[PDB]
Amino acid sequence: RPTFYRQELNKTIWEVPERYQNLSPVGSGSVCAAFDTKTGLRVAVKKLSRPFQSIIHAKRTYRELRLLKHMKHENVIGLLDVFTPARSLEEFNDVYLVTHLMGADLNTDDHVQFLIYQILRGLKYIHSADIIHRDLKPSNLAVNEDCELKILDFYVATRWYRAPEIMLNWMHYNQTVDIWSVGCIMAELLTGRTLFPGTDHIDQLKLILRLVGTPGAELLKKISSESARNYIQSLTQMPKMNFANVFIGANPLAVDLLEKMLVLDSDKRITAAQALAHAYFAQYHDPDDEPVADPYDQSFESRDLLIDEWKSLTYDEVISFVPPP
Ligand SMILES: CC(C)c1nnc2ccc(Sc3ccccc3CNC(=O)Nc3cc(C(C)(C)C)nn3-c3ccccc3)cn12
């Protein structure tokens, strides 16, 4: 057990071990940039805000610790450390998570290729563990000075990058909701503007369909909701736009990848693994250096437990933590 010290910063209190110095607020849980004396590197420290306030929070606290302890990939946030000032379960009420500080977020063709390749390389990994991100957006992509990128989950509206099947309230969405978001991000990097800046879920849907066109009969037959159908079919029919004409000036391979990512029917969207093998990333692609994840146990997601049970499970995960070499 190391020596802890207390400090108040931006209304929040921070009790962290001696090893972490020069705590500097970065976002408000609440995140601080800091210096790690044991390793010599800059770190990001997240203090969980009200971890065990409700069952929803307690399960979220557990889910985040479990997720971060599992992620071991260059393009995904990983845990350097996890600590609590608490010396027993009884005293346990605060969680701090430590990771590498990248320094900035996401908000040249070679630049875009490298940035998207990294997002896709990290998404191939998370999708392999049967995890869906569901909120990929520029603010959730951390970038260092070497232009190295990590996916995380930390104002820019979420709905701007959300797959149309989520806006339309479909419960059965798949992993490709994240490829949609990648398409949106890649477009924004290429042109310098938000592909679909909707003001609400209705407007957002109208903006998407303006580009990709209104659903064909094959997709319309897959929509069970009379309300989702009676809305979409009640809109003035729109054809699919020519992407070469909307993304005029861009590398034709980037336009071709955009067409494969931004397909309305999610069953027809390119996966992260297929996108990695697209001609656009020929300069980066190496199937021997795009690893998959170890099996991830997410059976807990289906459980309905008490705050104290989620709390005790989180505590054990803090105790069992083994730092990387
Ligand atoms: C300040 C900004 C410039 C910056 N630069 N580098 C970093 C690194 C991290 C952060 S935020 C941070 C800091 C420490 C510990 C944890 C976090 C962020 N938490 C996080 O990414 N959570 C996360 C990742 C995923 C994945 C694995 C799905 C991506 N899911 N979750 C999550 C799960 C449940 C609830 C909340 C989040 C800022 N940095």
Ligand SMILES: Fc1ccc(-c2c[nH]nc2-c2ccnc(F)c2)cc1
């Ligand atoms: F306006 C639309 C119509 C269909 C989609 C869509 C894309 N991929 N999957 C769906 C979908 C949506 C709702 N219910 C479903 F069953 C499948 C998205 C927007």
